């Protein structure tokens, strides 16, 4: 519950970021 | 505040890199 | 608007600016 | 009508890049 | 604070897109 | 009264942004 | 400085960094 | 990951995203 | 807060410009 | 002496991109 | 094995760009 | 004592920034 909340506060690694790909 | 419009510019550049040929849906929502 | 070829991360960032609060899909294949 | 072929290989007008908005 | 030097980097990328062949004057002032 | 003030706090759409073009 | 062709949004961002508080004009036609 | 030629400031930003807290070296000559 | 992960994206683009052929080591540390 | 022709088509030195500062 | 020749002139996989991390 | 501290709070000019080059 969701990208703007999770990746804008703490850094999101590339591994966290793949969860938002198709 | 956290500015989500300036952060969203970085994240879409980051998703572009990370997804590649897969692609992604983005919604500031 | 700019009248150019928009490729790679540039086309992403354009989509970001243009679509705004509605958001967008990027599926390049 | 593929976005790369449309806007990266060819040139897209503003109306044609809105097609790809949600 | 709002950081206007980091925001100004985004806005000039945004004006580049939006003005195109017209161009623009920018002043952080 | 002017771009840095108006577009850095609230989002500025492309329509607001054309006002700063030549 | 970098010794390269600077085009599109790259040349904008360079102007931004170089000119600083004085600001710049971009008229590409 | 994206399967493309990454040049100039793009390759920098990729390094930034990929290497993360460890950091990176960019020596292009 | 100051967000150093979003700022670091700008600085590495800025070092890329300013160092050129010299290059640079970056560490968010 | 046009900035595209100068710095995008050719290569500009740092001094030559300062010409375009305010 | 030079990073420009590797990732800008050729195409680099993710593993090959990690070689250049600290 | 060091780049993230000095260039993220106050603006850093290009002259300050060359100190971090090789
Ligand atoms: Cl930012
Ligand atoms: Cl490019
Ligand atoms: Mn930013
Ligand atoms: Mn580019």
Residue J20 · residue J3 · CB < 8 Å: yes
Residue J15 · residue G18 · CB < 8 Å: no
Query: In chain E, how many domains are there?
Result: 1
CB atoms within 10 A of CB D16: 14
- Dist. CA B11–CA B16, nearest whole Å: 8
From the CA of I3, the nearest ligand is 1
Q: How many H-K residue pairs are in contact by the CB < 8 A criterion?
A: 50
- Dist. CA E20–CA F16, nearest whole Å: 15
Q: Is I9 on the interface with B (CB under 8 A)?
A: yes
User: What secondary structure does DSSP assign to C1-29, as a single string?
Assistant: ---S---THHHHHHHHHHHGGG-EEE---
Ramachandran quadrant class, A16 (left: phi over 0; alpha: psi -120 to 50; beta: rest)? alpha
User: What secondary structure does DSSP assign to E1-29, as a single string?
Assistant: ---HHHHHHHHHHHHHHHHGGG-EEE---
Residue A17 · residue A4 · CB < 8 Å: no
Q: Nearest to residue J13, comparing CAs of F19, C25, I14, G5?
A: G5
Residue E24 · residue F22 · CB < 8 Å: yes
Residue C13 · residue B13 · CB < 8 Å: yes
Q: Is E1 on the interface with G (CB under 8 A)?
A: no
Q: Are H12 and I17 a contacting pair at CB < 8 A?
A: no
Method: X-ray
Residue H11 · residue H3 · CB < 8 Å: no
Distance from CA of G12 to the nearest CA of C (A): 13
**G interface residues, L as partner, C-beta within 8 Å:** 17-18, 20-21
Q: Find the residue in B nearest to A15 (Cα).
A: B18
Contacts 24+ apart (CB under 8 A), A8-14: A8/B2, A8/B4, A8/B7, A8/B8, A8/B11, A8/I3, A9/B2, A11/H20, A11/H21, A11/I5, A12/B11, A12/B14, A13/H20, A14/B18, A14/H17, A14/H18, A14/H20
Structural domain boundaries enclosing I13: 1-29
- Dist. CA E20–CA F22, nearest whole Å: 10
Distance E17 CA to ligand 3 centre (A): 16
CB atoms within 10 A of CB L6: 15
Q: Are I7 and E9 a contacting pair at CB < 8 A?
A: no
Token code pair at residue A8:
């804008």
This structure's resolution (angstroms)? 2.2
Helix (H, G, I), strand (E, B) or coil at F22: coil
Angle, CA F19 vertex, CA F13 and CA F22 arms, to 5°: 130
């Amino acid at each position: 519950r969701g990208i703007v909340e999770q990746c804008c506060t703490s850094i999101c690694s590339l591994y966290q970021l793949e969860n938002y790909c198709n | 505040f956290v500015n989500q419009h300036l952060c969203g510019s970085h994240l879409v550049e980051a998703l572009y890199l990370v997804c590649g040929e897969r692609g992604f849906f983005y919604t500031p929502k």
